[PDB]
Every structure is written in structure tokens, then in C-alpha cells.
Design a protein around this ligand. Structure first.
Ligand code: CAP
Ligand code: CAP
Ligand code: K
Ligand code: K
Ligand code: MG
Ligand code: MG
Ligand code: MG
Lengths: 459, 454, 162
């Protein structure tokens, strides 16, 4: 088994050059009292490809040729790298294309229940051209949103967004009134992830009231407005019904619609339903639930980097990549590498370089405890603002309301792009300055002398 | 922000919340992150991020919204326990048929709350579904009773279904695969696709399905007994899942009611499970949970346990789900996991925190699998209390010294030994295939039956 | 073309020239002689196109020709070690016939399904036929064949459009 499933003589550069293997890098610890590191890594490769925990009479030479192989170990750093012959992965009968479900079942499936492994988490993976080209990839990108907004389709810049808050509770007309207010100052509105067809806010009534708010805001401002609707369901046919109803209702504003799918909880099947049924609608991948495995506190499953890289292959137009430590959710500054892996044609993960061969980019959607004050620091860490940022609390929690909240987000990115000092910039921008008084604990930490500098009382 | 006043009401009585029938209840083991809020403050912010709030006050909140807030109604900080009540009006329903969706239950009760920067961890150990919400779930349409009927067994307590998994997990070409099916079916009842088996370039789906259909006819002609197969129809594309399923049923023809459909429900998700449940309600839906250990392991302090996963699967309409070997096999499991089996088979059962009435919703079968063999079976059944289930032993059948068929008969004989209350070593002298499992897995025999070499 | 260059293993930016042919005679070749001419060209070239009227004629049934061409593609790819492409005419008056043809081709080609282009006689069958292929099969290269266009586009014509 250590002879069969482990070949540490293989050179990673040759496995990449050969283009016949998917590579996976894991941080793994063997359970005490079982096998050594290479034995545990060999049994892990067996349970992730062609074997079980005992020898079987049915094994032939052909089977041995599709074995996953351990090609590199670094026991001191708990690192194991496995090469998966690409012929292992399932393909559709209908169109010969790849499926992420098969990648998941083999590379991070049954190997997560092994009694002889304490834990194992995937940190990176490499997809060679012969397998990458079989994935859907995104059909709609931020370029399509920039075109609807009248922005340049190359570096069209920042899309000012929000989430309708409360997360649940608003009836159809109060919901649509909050949409109208935000759209007086902002571009994009997203359903909060569970909003759909609740008994107090029926889906068709809310969709119609929002379509009317979009027309009213566009007439008032003379600017195009965008909405991302949650179409998540267990039933594929419910997802189609929701999507079809939205496009028909929005009519001449149908290209202003994004479809949101809770891709981690509903699964890859739900993401593909939206991607294949509505390829001309921006597919917004919401990752609620992902923290159960992606948290740095978890030593199992896979990281947010791996989740995001899979989503690009699945065809997400955009995916939540987190605030990279600048918001309310778990995240780190080094998470900027996630955003570049999903937007660039060539990028480096923690272990593998990836060429995307012209596959469309996936937008990093920034969200979770963001507001005007936290934005300049976020953009400094990332390096660009060609993205969507949604701030629910940061817009509707603004002291002067959602419209002022939307302008504070707009003004916060204009401050960063100009290279201005946020406190100095706030004296000329009322809505941005009023975000300091809306979130005073954040202002005290990020800009310690803001009260004296903006001429406001209290502390 | 301290959201305790709004999102915590520890004066609520659990018995009254259950009697009211207007709330879903969830019990979590939670630890606040050091240097942030106290236990109640963290539990209140958790309830906020799981229902109607965010991390700051918003101008758009009204009294109506406050009425659908999730509420912390019980805390036991010493045992890291938090219980939250979710008004059932929070949960999404289908526009097409007004029915519930597990995706919404997951998004609210174990979604964004798993990324909170002020929580070290939080894992769901139990949940309660009141009648007004339970009745909106699909529940299973096909059960073990339908397999017992195809096998010619009594439809009440029809007993043990002897199964295997076709090993190698991947690598077998279509005819060698079907030859291993024929061999096992000479002694056993049920064969399962190993979870990733589908349309690989070396074993095309249609060729494998046709070769297996021919092996089923040959084994049934030879033995005079009905045989069952569970095919993996998992795909990202709903239409691929339909194409696979439709092709299998048409090919199997007069044996179409001998087919189960396997879905890798944890990796492909609830959407894939529902595709199979709603498109093929008359085909036994076999929920394979590959990947689940990333959250269900006792080593994980996040997500949800295997008990919670299994209870959701029954609501989703799984006919059967892998419940693990309860510590008797190769995967992580514990003897107390027998409570998982009762929660999914009985009409009334107790979880670690909540009693559940199922109101006649069909049972889900415990599918026992993962490092099982004829030697480990009598101990497993003693712990569970019955054998009205499917057990699949891949290595335990194809790893038997005399082959598949002998492997199958040792699984059959091992359950017959348990039902008779016989001593396995004494029983083995009269049952050759059962005795030859001792020599097939000698390390297991040395631990379970120390003086067997005789 | 970037998607064809990727299947050919060429750079996806300026991947260069795709060497192609049309299976002649325009009509008359039975399924195996047709597929034998595909195999021969593919020993030296990249792309083969159905001549514009080739489909389901009584002497070259569609399913038989599609299967014989799928076998010739596998044989040429095994022989040369290079990827090969085919553009199939799926033109029909009936939208559902266009879907049946396309679906049958993709299922038959299986692991070579991304080597398939769909040809539509867009000028004679019309924009409705072009959109059927574009919307039903957006991941298959849509090859617009303009047979008939000369009736208006010719410089001799002073009507219609160029
Ligand atoms: O429900 C929420 O909490 C949010 O709407 C943010 O609202 P706020 O702006 O008010 O905080 C998003 O779903 C989270 O950002 C998801 O986290 P992530 O992006 O990390 O997946
Ligand atoms: O691939 C495997 O390992 C198995 O086929 C068992 O094969 P063996 O009989 O040879 O061990 C099953 O998928 C596991 O039982 C899944 O674990 P669980 O039931 O816990 O979901
Ligand atoms: K090496
Ligand atoms: K209480
Ligand atoms: Mg949200
Ligand atoms: Mg398996
Ligand atoms: Mg021609």
C-alpha cells in the first residue's frame, strides 16, 4: 500500500508538465497509535481513488494505473500532496463535461471519516488543461454589470452595494421602499441570503414591488440599478420558477438582475442549476455555512481559498471571499490571494501556480460588517476596487438612512482612489462624515482624533 | 453591540414553545472567542445573525420584524450549551407547491453564524421541528418495506438485507465489474456503486449499467432470488441526474423495481437529493454521506453532528442513509449512535435534547457500512437491537479468502448467528463461509475471538 | 476560436491557424466511406466540416454517420496524439429536430464532446435556427454557414444587404 499508493520520486514539475493529473495539497495528522505519516498518506490516497482498507481479489493492472499517488510529504509541516489521474473524475453522459461533485467525492469525501486520520484539510489544488477545459466556468462577469451601469467594460470600477436588512421581517412594500432609498445613492442590492417566499413577504409580491422600486429609482436618478435575487431552493424546478418569474417581471430591466444561490448549503447541484439555466444572468454565489469547514479553527475539509477556486470552475460570476480581516467574519489580510486566484488568468495559491487558459474571472464580492470607515483599509490591502461590496448594517445603520449610507460607501471608495486621508476627506463629504458618528467605536479605533478633527462633540 | 435584550428571552419555557408549535428549536455547543462578549451576549448576536439582524442597529427594523426574531431561550454556560427558538415563519417555502426546503433551515440555523469573528465555534447537536413545519417536508416516498416486497420478504420486520460495495472503488472496467456483481449475488441481496462510480472514461456509464443488468438477470435465473442494485446518479447538472436515472430504469425494464438510486447528498447537496426524491419517488433513495466527517467528526467543534445530518435526511426524503458503524467499523463512530437509528426509523424518538414526533412520516433505513465484515457484525447488532436494515461490506465481501459469493454468505450467516443468539466461534464450525472470514481478517479475529485458531 | 485553441492545446491568445476541410462529395458518401475520408484528412489536419446539406439522407442516415465519424475521430487522435474537431450540420425547420441532432452528437462523442462545433445554415433556415443552436448549446462552437446569401449580398444585387 505504501509501495502502491506512494511515489515520492515523482517530480511535481513533471506531473504539471504531463497534464494528466489533478494535484491536491493537504495539512494532515495521523491518529496516534495507527500508522506513520507516509503509511497514513498512502491509505488516504487509496480511500480517495481505487482502494479500501484491505486487499481485494478484483484489483487488476488497469486499476493500478489510475491509483492516486502521494508524490510529496513534509511531515514536520504536516504536508501531504497527492496526484489524482484525471481519468478518475466523473463526466456527464449528456455533454462530456466535468462535475465538481466528483472532484469533491474523491479528493475530500470518504477520506474525511477515516478512523486512522486525526484530521486532513485541503489547502490547494491544481487542475491541468485537459480537466480545466471540461468545466463550465463563468458565462457572465462583472464586465456585464459594468456595461449595464454604463461604466467602461475594462476596469469599470467599484459597484456600491447593500443587503436589504432586516435579514427577514420586511413585508413587500417596506422591503421595496428600502430598495428605492438605497438606490438613490447606490448601485446594487442583494437579497439577504434567506429572503425568498416567506409567508409574510410572498416572493411574487416582493419581486413586483422591487421591480417598481427599480423603475422609480432609475427614473429619479437617471442611473441604472441592479438587484441580486435569491433563487435558492432544494427543488431545481422551484429555482427555475423563481428565475423565470423575475426575468419576465423585470422585462426591459431583465439584464439588471443577478441570481443569488446559497451554494455551500444547497450545494453544487443548485449552483449548476442557475449557471446552466440562466447563463446570461450574473450568478452570485453566497457561501453561508462555509465557516463550518473553512474556519482556521477547523483542521478538516477545505479552506476558503479552495472553495473560491472551485466556484470559478462551477461558473459563479461572483463569490463572497470575505473581508480579509477588515469586517465582522473570520478572515485574514493574506486572503487577498483568494481574490487574485479568481480574477486573474494566472495566479499562485499557497502550493500551486494556476493558468486559467482564458476562463472567465469570478468577482470577489466583499461583505460582512463593512462600512464606509473600514473600506479605505480594505482596498489598501487588496490593491483594487474592481469588485462588488455589499454593506447591510453599513448602509441601513447609517444615522441619516439607507440613501446617505449608500453615498458614504460611494464616497469611501472615491476617498481611497484619490489617495486622500479619510478624516480630511470627510469635511467635504457629509454622508461619509456622518458614518463616523453612525459607527463611533469603529471611528475611535481607525481614526483616533476624528471628533476633534471633524468638529463633533461627546468624547 | 450588546443584543441580549432583543434576541435573548431566558424566561421562555421550552415545554410551552414545543406546545405552541410555532418554533423550530436548535441546541448548540458554543464557545465565545476570548476578548469579545460574554456567553449570553454571544448567543444573542448568534441568534441575530441566524434570523433578522446583523452586527449593528438598522433604521429599517419595525415591530413586525421583532416578532420573527430568533430567541435564545436557554443557556448552560458550564456545559457550553445554547438553545435557540426560530419562529417557523422565517423559513423559506416553495412558490410552486408551498412546501419546505432544507436549504432554508440550513442557511438560517447553521449558515453565516459559522463565520462569526466573535465565536470560537458552535455546533448543532439537535433540532426540533413542530407539526406545522414537519408536515411541509417531503419525507421518504420509498422505504425498506418496498425492498422487502421486491425480495419476497414480509413487509413488516422483513429482516436483514445482505449487501456489498463493488471494490475497487474505481478501476473496474464494465464486464469485470458485472462479473463481481454476479459472484456476490450468488450469496447476497444488494450491491451498491462505490460513491464516485459513474461515467469514467475506462467504465462508461451505459456499458456498465447494461453489463450489471445482464449480471442481475443471470444471478436471478441461477438463484431463483431477487437481487438489488444501488446506482450512483449524482451529478452537478440536474438533467444529467435525470438522464442517468431514466437510462437505468429503461435498461433494467422488468427489474426496474430492483433499483435504488444513490446520491452523494453531503457533497452534491440537498438540491441533488431532492432531484432524485422528486423525479424518482418510486425508487429507493440511498443517501451516501461521503465528506460529512469534515463537520460531523467529534474532533470538529463546528457545523453539526451525524445525528443532525441523519434527522435532516429523513425530512429530505432519503429512503436510507449511512448512519455509520457506531464504533464497530473503520470510520469514526460511537456506540451511542444507535439513537441516530431510532430517530430515523421510529414514529417517536429522543435526540440528545429534543423529543420528536414524526406524525407518520416514513422511516429512513440505517445503512450500515465502513470496514464491516462477518466477524464485526454480531457485536454491532447487540448494540443496535435489530437487523431490519441494509449492511454493505465492500472489503468484508470482496476481501473474503474464497471470493465474493463466500463473502456474501459469511455476511448472511453472521446475522443468522446473531438472530439465533449463538456464540460466533461455536457457530463457525457448521458454517464454512462464516469460518473462512476468521482466516480472511485474522487481526479482527485475534481481537474479537482470542482462541479462534482451533 | 479561443475555445477551439484550448481543445487543440494551442495558446488561447493568438493560437493561430486551424487547418480544415469539407467532406466532399457534397452528398453521396455512405457512413463508413465518409468517416474514412475524415480519418485520412485528420492525419494531417485539424477541422472537418459537414458540407452544408449533409444530415439524415436515406443513403447516409444521421445516427450511422455520426457514430462512424466519432470512431474516426478516436482513431485519428490515437494515431496522431493530436486533438481533432468536427462541425456537424444540425439545421432543421423543426427546433426539436435541431435539439435531437445536437443532443445525439454530444452523447455519442462523450469525452470528445468539446471537440464538436454545430453548423447552422443561418441564411436559409433563418435567425430562429441560429438562436436555437446558440441558446440550446452555448458551450458548442456555433458555425454559421451562409449558403444562399449571394441572392442579396452579391455586388450584382442592388437590394437587401451586403
Ligand atoms: O447576512 C450577513 O451577515 C451579510 O448579508 C452581511 O450583512 P452586513 O453588511 O450587515 O454585515 C452577508 O451574508 C455576510 O457578509 C456573509 O459573510 P461572507 O461574505 O463572509 O460569506
Ligand atoms: O468507500 C467506502 O469506504 C465504503 O464503500 C465502505 O467500503 P468498505 O466496506 O470496504 O469499507 C462506504 O462508502 C463507507 O462506509 C462510507 O462511510 P459511512 O457509512 O460512514 O458514510
Ligand atoms: K517528490
Ligand atoms: K428558559
Ligand atoms: Mg447575508
Ligand atoms: Mg464507498
Ligand atoms: Mg459547402
Amino acid at each position: 500500500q505504501s509501495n502502491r499508493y506512494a511515489n515520492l520520486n515523482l517530480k511535481e514539475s513533471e506531473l504539471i508538465a504531463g497534464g494528466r493529473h489533478v494535484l491536491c495539497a493537504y495539512i494532515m495528522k495521523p491518529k496516534a497509535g495507527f500508522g506513520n505519516f507516509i503509511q497514513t498518506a498512502a491509505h488516504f490516497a487509496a480511500e480517495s481513488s481505487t482502494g479500501t482498507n484491505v486487499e481485494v481479489s478484483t484489483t487488476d493492472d488497469f486499476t493500478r494505473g489510475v491509483d492516486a499517488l502521494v508524490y510529496e510529504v513534509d511531515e514536520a509541516n504536516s504536508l501531504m500532496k497527492i496526484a489524482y489521474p484525471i481519468e478518475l473524475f466523473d463526466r456527464n453522459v449528456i455533454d462530456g463535461r466535468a462535475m465538481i461533485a466528483s472532484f469533491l467525492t474523491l479528493t475530500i469525501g470518504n477520506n474525511q471519516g477515516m478512523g486512522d486520520v486525526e484530521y486532513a484539510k485541503m489547502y490547494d489544488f491544481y487542475v491541468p488543461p485537459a480537466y480545466l477545459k471540461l468545466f463550465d466556468g463563468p458565462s457572465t462577469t462583472i464586465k456585464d454589470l459594468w456595461r449595464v451601469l454604463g461604466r467602461p467594460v475594462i476596469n469599470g470600477g467599484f459597484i456600491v452595494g447593500t443587503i436589504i436588512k432586516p435579514k427577514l421581517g420586511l413585508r413587500p412594500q417596506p422591503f421595496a421602499n428600502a430598495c428605492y432609498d438605497f438606490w438613490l445613492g447606490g448601485d446594487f442590492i442583494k437579497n439577504d441570503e434567506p429572503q425568498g417566499n416567506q409567508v409574510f413577504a410572498p416572493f411574487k409580491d416582493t419581486v413586483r414591488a422591487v421591480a417598481d422600486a427599480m423603475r422609480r429609482a432609475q427614473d429619479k436618478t437617471g442611473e441604472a440599478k441592479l438587484f441580486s435575487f435569491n433563487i435558492t431552493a432544494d427543488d431545481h424546478y422551484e429555482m427555475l420558477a423563481r428565475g423565470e418569474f423575475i426575468l419576465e417581471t423585470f422585462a426591459d430591466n431583465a439584464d439588471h438582475i443577478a441570481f443569488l444561490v446559497d451554494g455551500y448549503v444547497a450545494g453544487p447541484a443548485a449552483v449548476t442549476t442557475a449557471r446552466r439555466a440562466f447563463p446570461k444572468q450574473y450568478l452570485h454565489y453566497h457561501r453561508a455555512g462555509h465557516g463550518a469547514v473553512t474556519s482556521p479553527q477547523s483542521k478538516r475539509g477545505y479552506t476558503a481559498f479552495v472553495l473560491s477556486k472551485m466556484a470559478r470552475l462551477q461558473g459563479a460570476s461572483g463569490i463572497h471571499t470575505g473581508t480579509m480581516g477588515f469586517g465582522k467574519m473570520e478572515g485574514e489580510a493574506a486572503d487577498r490571494a483568494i481574490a487574485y486566484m479568481i480574477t486573474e488568468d494566472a495566479a499562485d495559491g499557497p502550493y500551486f501556480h494556476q493558468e486559467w487558459l482564458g476562463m472567465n474571472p469570478t468577482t470577489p464580492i466583499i461583505s460582512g460588517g463593512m462600512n464606509a470607515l473600514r473600506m479605505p483599509g480594505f482596498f489598501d490591502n487588496l490593491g483594487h476596487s474592481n469588485l462588488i461590496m455589499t454593506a447591510g448594517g453599513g448602509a441601513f445603520g447609517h444615522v441619516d438612512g439607507g440613501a446617505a449610507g449608500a453615498k458614504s460607501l460611494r464616497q469611501a471608495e472615491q476617498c481611497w482612489k484619490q489617495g486622500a486621508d479619510p478624516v480630511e476627506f470627510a469635511k467635504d463629504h457629509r454622508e461619509f462624515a456622518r458614518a463616523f458618528e453612525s459607527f463611533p467605536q469603529d471611528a475611535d479605533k481607525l481614526y483616533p482624533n476624528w471628533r476633534a478633527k471633524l468638529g463633533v462633540e461627546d468624547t
